[PDB]
Each structure stands twice: as C-alpha cells, then as structure tokens.
Amino acid sequence: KIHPGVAMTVVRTDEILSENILFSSRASTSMFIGTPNVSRREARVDAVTF
Amino acid sequence: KIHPGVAMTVVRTDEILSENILFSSRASTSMFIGTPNVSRREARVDAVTF
C-alpha cells in the first residue's frame, strides 16, 4: 500500500439511457404527402399480398 | 459339390403386376371443389412458365 511516484487519473465512459423531449413550432415543416399506390406482389392461390 | 456345415434359407421377393378391382359404396366421401386459380412461376423472356 505504498503510494507510487506517479499519480493516476482514471477515465471511463458512461452510457445513460435518457428519455428525451422534442419541441417544434407551428409550421416547422411542410409535408407534400402524395397518394399511395398498390403493387400486387404475391398473387398466391392462398392469400394475396398487396 | 460337397455339403458345408451350415444350410441356408434363401429368401427373395417376387413382384407381380396385378390388374385390380376397386369398389366403393355410394356417398362414401364429401368433397368441396375449390375454384381453379392461375399463377405464373418463371417469367421467362422466351416462354413464361405458368
């Protein structure tokens, strides 16, 4: 338990799960949302997947 | 052509093609006939595999 001739500083990262809060003003962005489409992918005899 | 100490029980199987007669009574089974449905499998550029 002899204190050495050098002094050690110990550095460690830390991970902290935050719970964040978002703000945005009125008309912060503007969405040009278009009409969605349909493409029949699976034309199965069992059940059709669009 | 001298007898050994042991004997054998030679076993083979014999196939036979038999014309058979099947009988079943009336109303033996109930059947739900689904509508036939088409599906492409391999869309070949020459000749599509239906």
Curated annotation (Swiss-Prot), chains A, B:
Transmembrane segments: none annotated. It comes from the Viruses. It is found in: Virion; Host nucleus. Self-assembles to form an icosahedral capsid with a T=16 symmetry, about 200 nm in diameter, and consisting of 150 hexons and 12 pentons (total of 162 capsomers). Hexons form the edges and faces of the capsid and are each composed of six MCP molecules. In contrast, one penton is found at each of the 12 vertices. Eleven of the pentons are MCP pentamers, while the last vertex is occupied by the portal complex. Belongs to the herpesviridae major capsid protein family. Homomultimer. Makes the hexons and eleven out of twelve pentons. Interacts with triplex proteins 1/TRX1 and 2/TRX2; adjacent capsomers are linked together in groups of three by triplexes, heterotrimeric complexes composed of one molecule of TRX1 and two molecules of TRX2. Interacts with scaffold protein; this interaction allows efficient MCP transport to the host nucleus. Interacts with capsid vertex component 2/CVC2. Interacts with the small capsomere-interacting protein/SCP. This is Major capsid protein.
